[PDB]
Amino acid sequence: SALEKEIGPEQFPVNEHYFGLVNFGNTCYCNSVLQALYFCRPFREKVLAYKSQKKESLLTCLADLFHSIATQKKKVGVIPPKKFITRLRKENELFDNYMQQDAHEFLNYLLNTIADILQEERKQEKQNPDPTWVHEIFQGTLTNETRCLTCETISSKDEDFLDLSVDVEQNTSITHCLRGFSNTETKYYCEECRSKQEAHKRMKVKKLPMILALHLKRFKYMDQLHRYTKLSYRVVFPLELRLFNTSGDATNPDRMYDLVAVVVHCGSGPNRGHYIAIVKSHDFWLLFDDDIVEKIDAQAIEEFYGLTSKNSESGYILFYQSRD
Numbered sequence: 216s217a218l219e220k221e222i223g224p225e226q227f228p229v230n231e232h233y234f235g236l237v238n239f240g241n242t243c244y245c246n247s248v249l250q251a252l253y254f255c256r257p258f259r260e261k262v263l264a265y266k267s268q269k270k271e272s273l274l275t276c277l278a279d280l281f282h283s284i285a286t287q288k289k290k291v292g293v294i295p296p297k298k299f300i301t302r303l304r305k306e307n308e309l310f311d312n313y314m315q316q317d318a319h320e321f322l323n324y325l326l327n328t329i330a331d332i333l334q335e336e337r338k339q340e341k342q343n344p345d346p347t348w349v350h351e352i353f354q355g356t357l358t359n360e361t362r363c364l365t366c367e368t369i370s371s372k373d374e375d376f377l378d379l380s381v382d383v384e385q386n387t388s389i390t391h392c393l394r395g396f397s398n399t400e401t402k403y404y405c406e407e408c409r410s411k412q413e414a415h416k417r418m419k420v421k422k423l424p425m426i427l428a429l430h431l432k433r434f435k436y437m438d439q440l441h442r443y444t445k446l447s448y449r450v451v452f453p454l455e456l457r458l459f460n461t462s463g464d465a466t467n468p469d470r471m472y473d474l475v476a477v478v479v480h481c482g483s484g485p486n487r488g489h490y491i492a493i494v495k496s497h498d499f500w501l502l503f504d505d506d507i508v509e510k511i512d513a514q515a516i517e518e519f520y521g522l523t524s525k526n527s528e529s530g531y532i533l534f535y536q537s538r539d
């Protein structure tokens with residue numbers, strides 16, 4: 216195939232398989248996220264290892280699927296994920312139609328589901344609570360403080376996440392968006408003032424995950440049109456990204472990341488559109504457009520930042536892997 220041809224027989228990785236997924240009609244929201252996840256190596260490994268070990272679930276289908284790919288005879292090709300998509304439609308009825316879906320709802324549904332499938336599973340080893348391997352890879356923790364402006368009382372409470380969603384604005388960077396995330400907001404009752412009071416709410420990242428799934432919120436409800444729009448803003452993201460936690464732990468203030476996958480959305484609105492995935496594999500990058508698989512140049516990633524200027528090709532979910 217021309218894919219192998221373009222990587223080169225020298226650069227083509229040992230035991231790697233590059234296989235496209237068939238669109239069954241608006242199922243690219245699923246394909247693209249599936250490819251993205253397949254190229255998160257910690258995740259690919261845990262699910263491959265799951266296949267080895269049991270009652271039919273979303274996870275068995277994923278594991279069958281990832282297994283099917285990583286087992287393929289040929290080096291390049293195309294697989295129809297029929298069983299996974301059926302299982303997904305049977306299991307979650309908000310996807311059981313031929314309308315386009317939100318790739319981020321899928322990702323988030325998939326991780327949540329695979330999470331507590333494995334919870335209910337180790338609740339069946341203990342007693343034939345203990346963080347799952349989904350959590351190990353993707354879980355982070357944020358604290359949302361609130362200060363009563365009257366008495367200055369801060370109330371913290373943590374919450375865990377498997378993905379993080381940030382708001383976008385025109386001509387900015389991921390960095391600018393994460394900073395905006397920790398930014399103060401202002402309807403409260405504090406146990407101290409014992410009245411209702413006015414306050415300042417903040418959100419801080421307490422624990423950084425080993426893989427940061429970063430959802431850019433490009434589908435906002437525009438109060439004008441009385442409809443959802445796709446925001447095609449130029450939002451730049453780096454190939455590498457140093458982030459900080461608010462843990463105060465002086466030995467772990469930090470986490471360094473490399474970009475491994477981008478889910479990009481192509482189009483001009485959340486109903487008319489197409490999803491693709493940009494993934495890193497060893498020294499090169501691949502674009503998966505459903506069945507079409509092809510080598511992309513890393514400089515060409517910047518095509519997916521979006522426009523300063525209707526239809527566009529924008530990064531929508533970024534997957535950053537730690538070097539940890």
Ligand SMILES: [Zn+2]
Pocket residue numbers: 363364365366367368405407408409412
């Ligand atoms: Zn107060």
